[PDB]
Design an enzyme around this catalytic site. Structure first.
Site, PDB file in Angstrom:
ATOM      1  CG  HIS A 170      -2.114   0.921   1.029  1.00  0.00           C
ATOM      2  ND1 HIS A 170      -2.182   1.877   0.035  1.00  0.00           N
ATOM      3  CD2 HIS A 170      -3.267   1.026   1.728  1.00  0.00           C
ATOM      4  CE1 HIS A 170      -3.324   2.533   0.133  1.00  0.00           C
ATOM      5  NE2 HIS A 170      -4.000   2.040   1.155  1.00  0.00           N
ATOM      6  CG  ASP A 400     -11.526  -6.353 -22.450  1.00  0.00           C
ATOM      7  OD1 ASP A 400     -11.087  -7.524 -22.342  1.00  0.00           O
ATOM      8  OD2 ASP A 400     -12.213  -5.967 -23.421  1.00  0.00           O
TER       9      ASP A 400
END
EC number: 2.3.1.153
Length: 454
Positions: A170, A400
């Site tokens: 993070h 995608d």
């Protein structure tokens, strides 16, 4: 576990079209997040093709595309350097002479794929099982330890689908930034080496010369974190056995209206409240979340913490595509008695909005009270807490790689805490998918009260 690993490899940026070195500073925004080495992001895909095609074509082109997109996201191929000795400060570093590189895991799993992607109850462990366990420290230099930043685990369900499971420290990216990266990686795979990531707004910015620490937050944040980093650093990286299940909830934009007007109707004239898709969705979820606890068996305060993207509020102007952490701590508070009562939804939404106005919309600056962000969080009882990671702003279903949008996007790292995540809905335009994680007895309580609110 039914996940068998097929291959472990290393993905580097392109050779001879990169710098041998890239050092990057640790802004005061990144310091609160240094102890959190898991920001997981799972993505299931429908893939009705033979395991052969997977290995023959799919793995190469991902290995391929990942390399290309790494030349624009170079720090993600490096590590975090954490100081061993007092008086030194953390930093990021990519050394091509160290063979710095993301670990890709090619895996194969024999579980039910349509189960693992569904919105109905899903064992949270099955999901953490699809992620690679990054090492705590890959090597120790003489000033700092070397802590890895990103690993991905691609996992095939033969003739069913693919599951792309990322794991970022993070320290190196917040929710907005990490989704940009995943979407560039997908984009360049889908279209090809001549893919315009600039035109697609998937081109990062790593210039932090415009990030200025005018309130001395860096010095203050480092010293408060010192205690945390020692305690939380000695956690072996394996995922504990979660006694928590996962369920997924979907609100239309219209079902947000049914909540919006429900608040407006509850005579919320008295002070005018800010009513957004975010504050609605949390407001309602928090209200249900509070009630669920009672049905399982007070009048104290319930807290609901969230983050907010300061990139737009900073000074100097900070780029929208600035890569890294750039978040603000907001903590709503409200009475248990009130949140479960007749105006619970109205109390919650008012509370969440009243937390942004004092923090984000602080008409004195975001960082005006920032010397306190780190000292409000700890003053929350773990017994009275709710958190939310992610945001409807991020294009989670636009990843995608060339097989279609995802079947599901799961911020799997929620189970490590009393968290929910809220994500752009896949099938509804301005909707939201709410990922909830709770033990099953608890979880049944939640959904019941969730369904009843309409």
């Amino acid at each position: 576990q039914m996940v068998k690993v097929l291959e472990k490899c290393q993905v580097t940026p392109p050779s001879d079209t990169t710098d041998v070195e890239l050092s990057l500073p640790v802004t005061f925004f990144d310091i609160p997040w240094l102890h959190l080495n898991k920001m997981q992001s799972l993505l299931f895909y429908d893939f009705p093709y033979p395991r052969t095609h997977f290995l023959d074509t799919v793995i190469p082109n991902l290995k391929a595309s990942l390399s290309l997109t790494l030349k624009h996201y170079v720090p993600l191929s490096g590590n975090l350097l954490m100081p061993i000795k007092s008086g030194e400060m953390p930093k990021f570093q990519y050394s091509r002479d160290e063979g710095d590189s993301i670990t890709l895991i090619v895996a194969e799993s024999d579980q039910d794929f349509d189960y693992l992607k569904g919105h109905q109850l899903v064992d949270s462990n099955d999901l953490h099982g699809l992620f690679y366990v990054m090492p705590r420290v890959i090597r120790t230099m003489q000033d700092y330890k070397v802590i890895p930043l990103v690993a991905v685990q691609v996992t095939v369900f033969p003739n069913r689908g693919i599951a792309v499971a990322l794991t970022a420290h993070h320290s190196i990216a917040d929710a907005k930034s990490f989704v940009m990266f995943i979407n560039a990686w997908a984009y360049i795979n889908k279209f090809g080496k001549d893919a315009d990531l600039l035109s697609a707004n998937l081109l990062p910015s790593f210039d932090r010369s415009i990030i200025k620490d005018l309130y001395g937050l860096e010095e203050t944040f480092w010293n408060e974190m010192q205690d945390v980093l020692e305690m939380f650093s000695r956690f072996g990286s394996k995922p504990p056995r979660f006694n928590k299940v996962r369920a997924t909830y979907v609100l239309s934009l219209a079902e947000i209206q049914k909540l919006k007007n429900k608040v407006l109707n509850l005579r919320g004239s008295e002070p005018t409240i800010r009513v957004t898709t975010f504050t609605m969705t949390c407001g309602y979820v928090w209200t249900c979340m509070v009630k669920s606890k009672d049905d399982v068996v007070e009048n104290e305060l319930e807290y609901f913490s969230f983050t907010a993207d300061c990139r737009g509020l900073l000074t100097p102007p900070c780029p929208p595509n600035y890569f890294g952490n750039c978040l603000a701590s907001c903590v709503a508070k409200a009475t248990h008695k009130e949140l479960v009562g007749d105006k619970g939804l109205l109390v919650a939404v008012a509370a969440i909005g009243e937390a942004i106005e004092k923090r984000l919309h602080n008409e004195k600056g975001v960082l005006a009270d920032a010397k306190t962000w780190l000292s409000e969080s700890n003053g929350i009882p773990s017994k009275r807490f709710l958190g939310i990671t992610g945001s409807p702003k991020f294009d989670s279903y636009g990843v995608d790689f060339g097989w279609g949008k995802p079947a599901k996007f799961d911020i799997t790292s929620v189970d490590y805490a009393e968290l929910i995540y809220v994500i752009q809905s896949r099938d509804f335009e301005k909707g939201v998918e709410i990922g909830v994680s709770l033990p099953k007895i608890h979880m049944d309580a939640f959904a019941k009260i969730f369904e009843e609110g309409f």
